[PDB]
Amino acid sequence: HMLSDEQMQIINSLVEAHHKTYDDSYSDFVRFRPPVRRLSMLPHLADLVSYSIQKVIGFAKMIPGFRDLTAEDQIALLKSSAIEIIMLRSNQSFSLEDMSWSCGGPDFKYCINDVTKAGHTLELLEPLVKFQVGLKKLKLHEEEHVLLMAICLLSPDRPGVQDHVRIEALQDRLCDVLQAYIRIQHPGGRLLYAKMIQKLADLRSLNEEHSKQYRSLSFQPEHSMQLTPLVLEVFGSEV
Amino acid sequence: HMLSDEQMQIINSLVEAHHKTYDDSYSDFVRFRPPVRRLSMLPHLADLVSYSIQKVIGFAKMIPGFRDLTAEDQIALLKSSAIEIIMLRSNQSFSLEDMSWSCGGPDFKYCINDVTKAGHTLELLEPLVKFQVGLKKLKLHEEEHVLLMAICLLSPDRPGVQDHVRIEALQDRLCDVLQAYIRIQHPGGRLLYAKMIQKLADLRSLNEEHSKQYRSLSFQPEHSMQLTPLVLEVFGSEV
Amino acid sequence: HKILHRLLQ
Amino acid sequence: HKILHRLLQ
Numbered sequence: 001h002m003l004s005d006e007q008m009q010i011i012n013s014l015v016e017a018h019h020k021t022y023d024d025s026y027s028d029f030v031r032f033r034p035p036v037r038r039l040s041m042l043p044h045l046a047d048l049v050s051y052s053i054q055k056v057i058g059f060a061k062m063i064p065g066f067r068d069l070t071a072e073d074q075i076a077l078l079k080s081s082a083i084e085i086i087m088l089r090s091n092q093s094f095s096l097e098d099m100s101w102s103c104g105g106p107d108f109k110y111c112i113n114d115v116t117k118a119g120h121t122l123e124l125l126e127p128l129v130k131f132q133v134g135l136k137k138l139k140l141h142e143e144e145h146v147l148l149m150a151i152c153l154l155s156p157d158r159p160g161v162q163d164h165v166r167i168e169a170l171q172d173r174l175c176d177v178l179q180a181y182i183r184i185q186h187p188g189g190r191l192l193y194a195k196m197i198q199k200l201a202d203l204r205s206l207n208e209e210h211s212k213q214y215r216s217l218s219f220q221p222e223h224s225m226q227l228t229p230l231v232l233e234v235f236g237s238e239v
Numbered sequence: 240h241m242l243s244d245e246q247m248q249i250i251n252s253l254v255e256a257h258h259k260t261y262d263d264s265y266s267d268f269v270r271f272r273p274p275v276r277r278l279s280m281l282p283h284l285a286d287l288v289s290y291s292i293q294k295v296i297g298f299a300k301m302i303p304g305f306r307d308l309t310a311e312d313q314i315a316l317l318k319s320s321a322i323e324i325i326m327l328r329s330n331q332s333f334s335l336e337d338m339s340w341s342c343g344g345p346d347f348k349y350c351i352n353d354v355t356k357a358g359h360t361l362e363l364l365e366p367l368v369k370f371q372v373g374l375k376k377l378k379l380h381e382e383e384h385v386l387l388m389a390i391c392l393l394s395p396d397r398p399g400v401q402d403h404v405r406i407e408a409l410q411d412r413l414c415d416v417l418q419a420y421i422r423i424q425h426p427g428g429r430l431l432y433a434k435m436i437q438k439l440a441d442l443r444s445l446n447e448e449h450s451k452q453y454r455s456l457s458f459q460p461e462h463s464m465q466l467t468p469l470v471l472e473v474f475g476s477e478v
Numbered sequence: 479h480k481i482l483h484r485l486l487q
Numbered sequence: 488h489k490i491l492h493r494l495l496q
C-alpha cells in the first residue's frame with residue numbers, strides 16, 4: 001500500500017510550514033530581554049514563549065483546512081493548544097546529554113533551575129522533562145513530529161470550539177496521514193502510532209499544570225507586568 | 240527672607256526621591272529589549288518608557304502629601320501626567336551638543352531618527368526637541384528640576400481627579416517652595432519662575448500630541464503587541 | 479482577542 | 488488598573 005496525492009501534499013505542506021516557523025539557529029533569541037540567573041528568568045522566558053506563540057500561529061495558518069474554520073474556532077483552538085504545541089516544538093532543542101533545552105550558548109541553554117526562576121514549580125517541571133525525554137527517545141522523523149503538532153492543535157476536545165464536526169474531520173484526516181506514513185516509511189514501530197497518541201494525553205496534563213501556575217502568576221501584578229501582551233491574551237480567559 | 244523648616248524637608252524629600260529613582264549611568268538599559276536601526280526601535284523604546292513609568296511612580300510616592308490622596312487620585316494623577324514627567328526627567332540625558340538623548344554609548348544614544356523608528360511623527364518630535372533645548376538652556380539647579388516635576392504631577396487640571404481642593408493645595412505648597420527657593424538661592428532669574436510655569440503649558444501640548452499618536456498605535460494590534468502591560472495600562476483609557 | 483485575531487490575518 | 492494600583496503599594 002501507499003499514500004495518496006492528497007496525503008502527500010498534506011505532508012509537504014506541514015513540513016514546509018514547520019521549516020518556515022522554526023529556526024534551528026535560535027538567532028532571534030538575541031532580541032529577547034536577556035536572561036538573568038525573585039523570578040529573574042521570567043522576562044526572558046516570557047519573551048521566548050511570546051515569540052513561540054507567533055510561530056505556532058504561523059504553523060497553524062498553514063495546516064491544510066485550518067484556514068477554513070471560522071475565526072472563532074481558529075482562536076479557540078489556538079488559545080487552548082498553544083502551550084502544548086510549544087512544549088512539542090521545544091523537543092527539537094531538548095538534549096538528552098544534559099536534560100536542558102540548548103538553544104545556543106550558555107545564555108540560551110535553559111536548564112531546570114531556570115524554569116523555576118521563571119516562577120514555575122517542580123509540579124510542572126517534573127512531568128515536563130519526563131515528557132521531553134519520553135518524546136526524545138521516540139526518535140521521530142520530521143514528518144511524524146510535524147503531523148503530531150497538527151493533530152494536537154486540531155483536537156476537538158478544546159474549550160470554545162463550535163464546529164465539533166469540521167475540526168474533528170480535519171484531525172482524523174491528519175491521523176489517517178500519520179497512520180499511513182508510519183505504515184509505509186517507518187518499520188521498528190507497530191505501536192509508534194499508539195505511543196504518540198499517548199503523548200497527546202501527556203500534554204493535556206502538562207497543559208493543566210502550566211495553566212494553573214500561570215493563573216497564579218497573572219494575578220500577581222508585579223509578575224503579570226513582566227509578561228507580553230500576546231502571552232496575556234493567549235493564556236488569559238477572554239472567551 | 241528664608242525658607243521654613245517645612246519647605247526645607249520638602250526640598251530634602253524631593254531631591255532624595257529623585258536620586259533614588261534616577262540612575263545617571265543608565266545601567267539597567269542593558270535589560271531592555273535591544274535597539275534596532277517597519278518600527279524597529281519600538282520594542283526598545285517601549286521598554287524604556289515602561290521602565291521610566293516605574294521610576295516616576297516611585298518619585299510620586301515620595302512627594303510629601305501624595306501618599307495621602309486616595310488611591311483613585313494617585314492613579315488619576317499618574318495616568319495623565321506620566322508622559323510629561325518622563326519628558327521632564329529625560330532632560331537630564333539630553334545633550335545640546337548633538338540634540339540627542341545620550342544614555343550611554345552608541346546603543347543608548349537616541350537621536351531623532353530613532354524616535355521616528357518607534358512610530359512617532361515629526362509633529363511630536365519637532366516641539367519635543369524644542370522643549371528639550373528650551374528646558375536645557377534654563378540651567379536649572381537640581382532642586383528646581385525636581386520641584387518642577389512634582390508641580391507637574393500635582394496639576395489639579397487632570398482628567399479623573401476628585402479632590403480638586405486637596406491636590407490643588409499640595410501643588411500650591413510646592414509652588415510656594417519653588418518661588419521661595421528661586422528668591423533665596425537663584426539670582427540672574429527674576430522671570431525664572433514664570434519661564435518654568437511656561438514649560439508646564441508646553442508639556443500639556445506635547446502630552447496631547449503623544450497621546451494622539453499612541454492611540455493610533457495602540458489600535459494597530461501588530462504594534463500594541465510590542466508594548467508592555469504597564470505602558471498599555473498607563474496610556475490606555477481605563478477610568 | 480485583538481492581537482490573536484490580527485495575527486491570523 | 489491592577490498593576491498601577493499594586494505599584495503604588
Ligand SMILES: C[C@H](CCCC(C)(C)O)[C@@H]1CCCC[C@H]2/C(=C/C=C3C[C@@H](O)C[C@H](O)C3)CCC[C@@]21C
Pocket residue numbers: 045046048049052083086087089090091092093094101103110115118120214217231
Ligand atoms: C516555564 C516556561 C514558560 C514561562 C513563561 C510563562 C509565565 C508564560 O509560563 C516554559 C514552559 C513550557 C513551555 C516551553 C518551555 C521551553 C521552550 C523552548 C523553546 C526553544 C525552542 O525549542 C523554540 C521553542 O518554540 C521554545 C523550555 C524552557 C521553558 C519554557 C519556555
Ligand SMILES: C[C@H](CCCC(C)(C)O)[C@@H]1CCCC[C@H]2/C(=C/C=C3C[C@@H](O)C[C@H](O)C3)CCC[C@@]21C
Pocket residue numbers: 284285287288291322325326328329330331332333340342349354357359453456470
Ligand atoms: C517616542 C518615545 C516613546 C515611544 C513609546 C510609546 C509607544 C509609549 O510612545 C519617547 C517620547 C517622549 C518620552 C520620553 C522619550 C525619551 C526618554 C529618555 C529617557 C532616558 C533617561 O533620561 C531616563 C528617562 O526616564 C527616559 C527620549 C527618547 C524618546 C522617548 C522614549
